């Protein structure tokens, strides 16, 4: 798989167990971003997985 990572542009508070909460600056590994506008992510600071809203992130590296 890809080793690219994304960075959060804003804080986000999850509204459901399926979705991550994250902080601005958090580095997120995307497992998939080809099925819809919410992407399947892995936090490289908490280790949790969950969906994130793709408008809240940008590529970092």
């Amino acid at each position: 798989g890809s080793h690219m990572t994304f960075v959060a542009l804003y804080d986000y508070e999850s509204r459901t167990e399926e979705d991550l909460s994250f902080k601005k600056g958090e580095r997120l590994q995307i497992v998939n971003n080809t099925e819809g506008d919410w992407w399947l992510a892995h936090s490289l600071t908490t280790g949790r997985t969950g969906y994130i809203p793709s408008n809240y992130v940008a590529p970092s590296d």
């Binding site: 542009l9 804003y10 804080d11 819809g36 919410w38 809203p53 408008n55």
Partner: peptide, 12 residues
């Protein structure tokens, strides 16, 4: 059913 296919939330 897909969890990816939801509308995006507003930026804050």
């Amino acid at each position: 059913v897909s969890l990816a296919r939801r509308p995006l939330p507003p930026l804050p």
